[PDB]
Scaffold this active site. Sequence first.
Site, PDB file in Angstrom:
ATOM      1  N   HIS A   1      -4.552  18.441   2.396  1.00  0.00           N
ATOM      2  CA  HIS A   1      -4.289  19.882   2.307  1.00  0.00           C
ATOM      3  C   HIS A   1      -3.528  20.078   0.959  1.00  0.00           C
ATOM      4  CE1 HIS A   1      -5.378  20.263   6.528  1.00  0.00           C
ATOM      5  NE2 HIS A   1      -4.459  19.301   6.853  1.00  0.00           N
TER       6      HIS A   1
ATOM      7  N   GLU B   1       2.083  23.723   3.036  1.00  0.00           N
ATOM      8  CA  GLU B   1       2.023  23.585   4.486  1.00  0.00           C
ATOM      9  C   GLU B   1       3.479  23.611   5.016  1.00  0.00           C
ATOM     10  OE1 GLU B   1      -0.509  20.816   6.642  1.00  0.00           O
ATOM     11  OE2 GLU B   1       0.808  21.160   8.390  1.00  0.00           O
TER      12      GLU B   1
ATOM     13  N   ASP C   1       0.469  16.703   7.809  1.00  0.00           N
ATOM     14  CA  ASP C   1       0.345  15.628   8.836  1.00  0.00           C
ATOM     15  C   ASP C   1      -0.205  14.403   8.152  1.00  0.00           C
ATOM     16  OD1 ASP C   1       0.009  14.090  11.127  1.00  0.00           O
ATOM     17  OD2 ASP C   1      -1.745  15.258  11.786  1.00  0.00           O
TER      18      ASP C   1
ATOM     19  N   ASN D   1      -7.142   9.356  12.514  1.00  0.00           N
ATOM     20  CA  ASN D   1      -8.105  10.291  13.153  1.00  0.00           C
ATOM     21  C   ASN D   1      -9.457  10.225  12.446  1.00  0.00           C
ATOM     22  OD1 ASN D   1      -5.488  12.732  12.531  1.00  0.00           O
ATOM     23  ND2 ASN D   1      -5.554  11.481  14.424  1.00  0.00           N
TER      24      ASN D   1
ATOM     25  N   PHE E   1      -1.039   9.199  15.821  1.00  0.00           N
ATOM     26  CA  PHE E   1      -1.638  10.452  15.402  1.00  0.00           C
ATOM     27  C   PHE E   1      -2.052  10.474  13.941  1.00  0.00           C
ATOM     28  CE2 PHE E   1      -2.668  13.323  18.602  1.00  0.00           C
ATOM     29  CZ  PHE E   1      -1.945  12.864  19.705  1.00  0.00           C
TER      30      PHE E   1
ATOM     31  N   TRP F   1      -5.074  16.709  21.901  1.00  0.00           N
ATOM     32  CA  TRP F   1      -3.762  16.939  22.459  1.00  0.00           C
ATOM     33  C   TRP F   1      -3.796  17.805  23.697  1.00  0.00           C
ATOM     34  CZ3 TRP F   1      -5.301  17.453  17.500  1.00  0.00           C
ATOM     35  CH2 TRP F   1      -5.679  18.723  17.055  1.00  0.00           C
TER      36      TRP F   1
ATOM     37  N   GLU G   1      -1.627  25.490   7.920  1.00  0.00           N
ATOM     38  CA  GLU G   1      -0.574  25.534   8.916  1.00  0.00           C
ATOM     39  C   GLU G   1       0.777  25.974   8.335  1.00  0.00           C
ATOM     40  OE1 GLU G   1      -1.535  21.583  10.431  1.00  0.00           O
ATOM     41  OE2 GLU G   1      -2.452  22.494  12.187  1.00  0.00           O
TER      42      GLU G   1
ATOM     43  N   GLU H   1     -11.383  22.724  10.624  1.00  0.00           N
ATOM     44  CA  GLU H   1     -11.233  21.398  11.251  1.00  0.00           C
ATOM     45  C   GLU H   1     -11.889  21.465  12.617  1.00  0.00           C
ATOM     46  OE1 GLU H   1      -7.004  20.355  11.198  1.00  0.00           O
ATOM     47  OE2 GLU H   1      -6.837  21.212   9.140  1.00  0.00           O
ATOM     48  N   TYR H   2     -12.695  20.435  12.961  1.00  0.00           N
ATOM     49  CA  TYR H   2     -13.237  20.378  14.328  1.00  0.00           C
ATOM     50  C   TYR H   2     -13.562  18.939  14.650  1.00  0.00           C
ATOM     51  CZ  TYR H   2     -18.182  19.723  12.862  1.00  0.00           C
ATOM     52  OH  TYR H   2     -19.365  19.171  12.347  1.00  0.00           O
ATOM     53  N   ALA H   3     -13.826  18.640  15.942  1.00  0.00           N
ATOM     54  CA  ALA H   3     -14.241  17.262  16.300  1.00  0.00           C
ATOM     55  C   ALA H   3     -13.232  16.239  15.831  1.00  0.00           C
ATOM     56  CB  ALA H   3     -15.633  16.927  15.716  1.00  0.00           C
ATOM     57  N   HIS H   4     -12.054  16.287  16.442  1.00  0.00           N
ATOM     58  CA  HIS H   4     -10.912  15.407  16.062  1.00  0.00           C
ATOM     59  C   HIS H   4     -11.273  13.928  16.412  1.00  0.00           C
ATOM     60  CE1 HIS H   4      -6.678  14.162  16.273  1.00  0.00           C
ATOM     61  NE2 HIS H   4      -6.636  14.978  15.189  1.00  0.00           N
TER      62      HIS H   4
ATOM     63  N   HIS I   1       4.264  23.689   8.438  1.00  0.00           N
ATOM     64  CA  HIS I   1       4.026  23.625   9.876  1.00  0.00           C
ATOM     65  C   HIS I   1       5.290  23.577  10.748  1.00  0.00           C
ATOM     66  CE1 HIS I   1       0.707  21.795  12.752  1.00  0.00           C
ATOM     67  NE2 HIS I   1       1.446  22.734  13.387  1.00  0.00           N
TER      68      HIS I   1
ATOM     69  N   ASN J   1       8.809   9.586  14.884  1.00  0.00           N
ATOM     70  CA  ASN J   1       7.486   9.406  14.277  1.00  0.00           C
ATOM     71  C   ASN J   1       6.425   9.848  15.254  1.00  0.00           C
ATOM     72  OD1 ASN J   1       6.108   7.068  15.879  1.00  0.00           O
ATOM     73  ND2 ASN J   1       8.229   6.439  15.397  1.00  0.00           N
TER      74      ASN J   1
ATOM     75  N   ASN K   1       4.207  14.141  12.152  1.00  0.00           N
ATOM     76  CA  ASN K   1       3.118  15.086  12.090  1.00  0.00           C
ATOM     77  C   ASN K   1       3.593  16.498  11.809  1.00  0.00           C
ATOM     78  OD1 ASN K   1       1.047  16.950  12.670  1.00  0.00           O
ATOM     79  ND2 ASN K   1       0.425  15.788  14.523  1.00  0.00           N
TER      80      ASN K   1
ATOM     81  N   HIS L   1      -8.236  13.085   3.425  1.00  0.00           N
ATOM     82  CA  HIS L   1      -6.889  12.925   2.791  1.00  0.00           C
ATOM     83  C   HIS L   1      -7.038  11.864   1.728  1.00  0.00           C
ATOM     84  CE1 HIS L   1      -3.581  14.970   4.502  1.00  0.00           C
ATOM     85  NE2 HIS L   1      -4.231  14.963   5.703  1.00  0.00           N
TER      86      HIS L   1
HETATM   87 MG   LIG Z   1       0.200  20.208  10.143  1.00  0.00          MG
HETATM   88 NA    NA Z   2      -3.188  13.493  12.520  1.00  0.00          NA
HETATM   89 NA    NA Z   3       7.591  10.507  18.526  1.00  0.00          NA
END
Ligand SMILES: [Mg+2]
Ligand code: NA
Ligand code: NA
Lengths: 409, 1011
Positions: free
Chosen positions: B379, B404, B189, B592, B589, B987, B449, B525-528, B406, B585, B90, B345
Amino acid sequence: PALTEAKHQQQFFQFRLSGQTIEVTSEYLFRHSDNELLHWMVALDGKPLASGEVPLDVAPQGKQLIELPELPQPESAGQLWLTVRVVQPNATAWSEAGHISAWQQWRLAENLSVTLPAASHAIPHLTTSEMDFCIELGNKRWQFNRQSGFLSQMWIGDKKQLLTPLRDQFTRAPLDNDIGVSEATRIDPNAWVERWKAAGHYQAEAALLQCTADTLADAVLITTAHAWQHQGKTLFISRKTYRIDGSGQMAITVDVEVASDTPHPARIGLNCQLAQVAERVNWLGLGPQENYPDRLTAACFDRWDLPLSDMYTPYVFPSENGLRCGTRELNYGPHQWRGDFQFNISRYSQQQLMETSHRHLLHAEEGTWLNIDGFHMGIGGDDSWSPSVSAEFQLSAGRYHYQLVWCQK
Amino acid sequence: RRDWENPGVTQLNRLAAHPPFASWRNSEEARTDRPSQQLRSLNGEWRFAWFPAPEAVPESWLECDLPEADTVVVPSNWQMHGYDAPIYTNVTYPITVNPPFVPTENPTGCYSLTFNVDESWLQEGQTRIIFDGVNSAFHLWCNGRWVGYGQDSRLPSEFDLSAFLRAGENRLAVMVLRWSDGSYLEDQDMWRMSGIFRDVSLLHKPTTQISDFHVATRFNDDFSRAVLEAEVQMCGELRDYLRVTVSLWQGETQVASGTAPFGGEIIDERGGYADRVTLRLNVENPKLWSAEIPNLYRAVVELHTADGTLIEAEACDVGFREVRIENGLLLLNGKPLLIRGVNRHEHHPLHGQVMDEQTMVQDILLMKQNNFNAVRCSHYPNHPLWYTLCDRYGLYVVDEANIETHGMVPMNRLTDDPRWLPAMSERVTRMVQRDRNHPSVIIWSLGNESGHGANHDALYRWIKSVDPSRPVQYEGGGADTTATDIICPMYARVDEDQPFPAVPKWSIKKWLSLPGETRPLILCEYAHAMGNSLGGFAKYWQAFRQYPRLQGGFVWDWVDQSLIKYDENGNPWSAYGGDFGDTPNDRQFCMNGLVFADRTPHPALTEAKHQQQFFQFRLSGQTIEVTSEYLFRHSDNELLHWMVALDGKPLASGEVPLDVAPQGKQLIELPELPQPESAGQLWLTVRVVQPNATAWSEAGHISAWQQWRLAENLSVTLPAASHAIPHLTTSEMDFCIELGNKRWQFNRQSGFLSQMWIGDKKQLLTPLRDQFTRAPLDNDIGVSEATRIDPNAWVERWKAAGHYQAEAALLQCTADTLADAVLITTAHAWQHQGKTLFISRKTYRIDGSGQMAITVDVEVASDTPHPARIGLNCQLAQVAERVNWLGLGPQENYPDRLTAACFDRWDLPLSDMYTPYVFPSENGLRCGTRELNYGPHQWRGDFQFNISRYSQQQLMETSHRHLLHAEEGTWLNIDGFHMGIGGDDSWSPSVSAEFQLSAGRYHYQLVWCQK
Ligand SMILES: [Mg+2]
Ligand code: NA
Ligand code: NA
Ligand SMILES: [Mg+2]
Ligand SMILES: [Mg+2]
Ligand SMILES: [Mg+2]
Ligand SMILES: [Mg+2]
Ligand SMILES: [Mg+2]
Ligand code: NA
Ligand code: NA
Ligand code: NA
Ligand code: NA
Ligand code: NA
């Protein structure tokens, strides 16, 4: 009573608790806390366990961390509560030495009771007759009328304890906020009082659906069910059990259903007119002053004891008043009620308060009127000319449950 | 040179970026968007060989095919063919962080193709090759001779092969590096893959050609008049006889046209662009484009001699729309938008990151069918066909640069470094040069990010200079920096502030009014939607509708990034991070989505559909007020269906045509309704139905619904007397009660109902016992790992307090004989290491009718963490085909995610009562249930329940859905109360306080009977 709520919400010190740590943050913009000390106290169900004081030295907008000492464990079941207060040791041009300017409480550890009571010295007896179910235990007697389905009389020795039977109550003498601008000569159908009136809340009569009695190994159990109706519609249904045991305690369980389409009721409780009058009122709950669901932040949970008249608020225009919420135990005369309820106690019935427009015309009735609520609606006040009780404070759940134990003390 | 370890070299010999070309040589084919003989596809079978590092590639490969190469389909990601593993990481980079270097072991994919070129392409003009997507960097040779190099996995790289090809057979050799310096800007991610994963094509252009063209549409104050301005640039032989004609068509009708010679206006002391021309066409009462009505015109750009010879033509779909932010609001055609968005994505469970038309179409249809009107390209720029589809089907698009970083520390380490300005600039500028004429693109984003660096400020400015028609947004560095026209936070909550240092996430309502702030706020981004999530979704929608400057957001995210793997038997199963040996890894995650990787919906999709409805309703009496939230269309394909039912029993229903103007209201007064004297609650349900099919939905599609309770007639009727009294039999170990053909056995040592017989058949496999825990949801676990516990996560708090291992201690168990019943009373305490966590007191009253009424009162220590549920559970002996209930449904619904569910009588196959989340957890709950029927049993009350062949223990212990196995019998969980599921993020704890079970004392009651 509202002044104390204003004082508390307008406090200049904010607090947070994290473990043994109390964080005090100052909301002053210009002065340091140079006339303040923090007093703290830990009590178990009202019984003091420990306390102390720490000087406050916080800059404007700053924070101060205060570590409380090791919290010796308590020796008994119960909920420990931490209260802190900000006291100004020195007099100023506007206050006397000792002035309390802020306070806050938190629950700390709770140890639930798991201890089985103890085998009763005796077993209550049930006497059944055509019109009543009577229970006797020692020098106490309870009488349940079979046609009304209510506890109509209770005796200690030969002394009757009730003037009116113990009955459910779903209404309150309307507050100014419940009335709004409504007038007999120009009804505002949207005001709460008018919605309640129109729905028949103040006129609904209890219809008995069931009244049975059973004997258990160490107790007698009375079961009842009533419907409250108006113009052929069922507004509320109340189902209860009264369990009287060898200890003399009467455990009351109440389960109520409220039709979804009726306006949410002002309260869901029971009421009665006690025969006796006593000097003091002592309770373990929020106080000491009057507090309601949407106006109880300033009240603190502790053991309070006041003269009965302090339990009545003399608003010039009378209405429901004097409630205390969050009460786990209430004592009055030889009686004790335990549970988790809201209550008010005074010499005036809700009926009189709603029929009287000026406090000077009220007159003490015989005995004492006790209203004990499992739930009570908020009082609102955003304005006093339109409904202002927030949704979260309306009794709209549809089904409600509460339980109380009445016993002698 | 190791050009792949040098951010100063991002390409060699690559041609300039431009909008989609096809070089038609007949204008009517350009007008109709038919295929062009000058644009060929090189997709198909290629030859491929995998190497562990570029140093292992043999020289012979440039001149001839490697005998050990395999033939594979292109486009593709080589991990999908098994050559090496895809990696799911991620934030942490998949490579050591040591810019600009990469591992010396760097998987290299050698692709080649032998293909034909007709002599005609070589007698004149220019022949180029175009690779739409190569991940992450590559060198290209044609006929053994080196052509060039390219980076940026997400935009096309084009090379002129004119001088390298010959008539007939030609061979390409493409050496693709998995890691390069471009990887430091590609830390999104998602799975980390590589290869030639987008289309490959060959384009013939004339020597004198259209090299770029930009189309703009400006309007008068009420949008009744527009000017279409098209700037056209040419390369090649510039002569006085050249002209450009731009014509605009609405269907087969030509609405406007202009012709002019080249030579733009003077722009400075040296003159003007003699190689450019701007045509301006006036258009009266243009049909405007929006996601609601995606009206399009076709502009044809003809390069030709004045006397009439078309040299070549290019063209595009044009959507007349203006996007602008004014007074704090983002407006489209002058009206304020409300973005019902989702991040999507490009992911396929079998093909990896390769996109195809069918899949795109399938995603756009489901998006629209579920009331989404917008999509963010999280992204990176998307496959080119995506924009065409959003222009035509109608979706607003946020087009995002492939930047990105991140995993850097701090996150802006590269973006604030001027040495990385050139590589970042190309990611931004080439995206704008390619996608600037698509009406669907309404906002440009600078990437994701990557913190906030001065490179972002420079680039924000560049776009604002080159393309004034669209706002620019960018979330990094706190979501309200100087590099964004829109406050666009990710996962900021509705009412709850999260005041992190430097980059706090304020409540969105409070954020809009901070001192000096005036910009619109749309969450990027909202409501994961990870696992059983979307709890609290309605809270966002109520805020968006109430605050004008809260203009919506993009849900994270559309589709789970699970990949198919095959077991020994050859059966497919959904895999996630680490399932390919990849490590480190980030496990599940990568999943989603609102939908599973094969596009089957997760239950949260219906919650999004409902909250995102375009019609709002109010009921007053028997008058329904419908309000439209459409900005530009009237409800010309909608009717309102209404139905009233008494506890599920249909009573009356009807339909009424809906005719509401955009933002308008309509009142509909319903007929005289029944008033049955018969007990129950009347419920009104209304649905908006589209009678006619559309480009994106079938006839009869339902677009919105809502319900209200009408009159309730509480039951006051007494049940007749029972010609029977149950009998009790006691022993030291049990209490047995018998009534007719039924029997109940209560164990005196445990204090529970251990068995029940109907007839003489046992009904339970495990006794009926209280349950205070649930197999934890992804939101309950958050980032906690056995190797790195996060003590603040709900699951860890429950574990540490001992909820999952607390044992019931019996405090009391008695039995009494009543007049017409037997009453059993019990009390138990659950403790852990000396602490009493919960106390359960109950009564079971079995009467002469055979019913068993259970009353439960639980106390929960105020100092233990609020528990997941307060309920009972048991394993029933029977397995029945169906589940029938009166309560919320028909899909899974939780306290904080039940607005979409409707109360009615539902009846589904057992299997539908289980939701196959890839990572197993508590699932399948239905709330607000008044009666539940399964086999011979019926339970009545006011509870939430789940029922399936899988125990909560099994779900908690199994990591993947395909490893679960049906248990004997059926597990039933019936809850008086259940904690919300959360999801504002996955998270940190996110269950709102009003959805936590913190009351201290709880009461519930049920009746269990037969039939
Ligand atoms: Mg990211
Ligand atoms: Na993710
Ligand atoms: Na891990
Ligand atoms: Mg407080
Ligand atoms: Mg490089
Ligand atoms: Mg022509
Ligand atoms: Mg020729
Ligand atoms: Mg609803
Ligand atoms: Na001080
Ligand atoms: Na009054
Ligand atoms: Na809004
Ligand atoms: Na219509
Ligand atoms: Na699991």
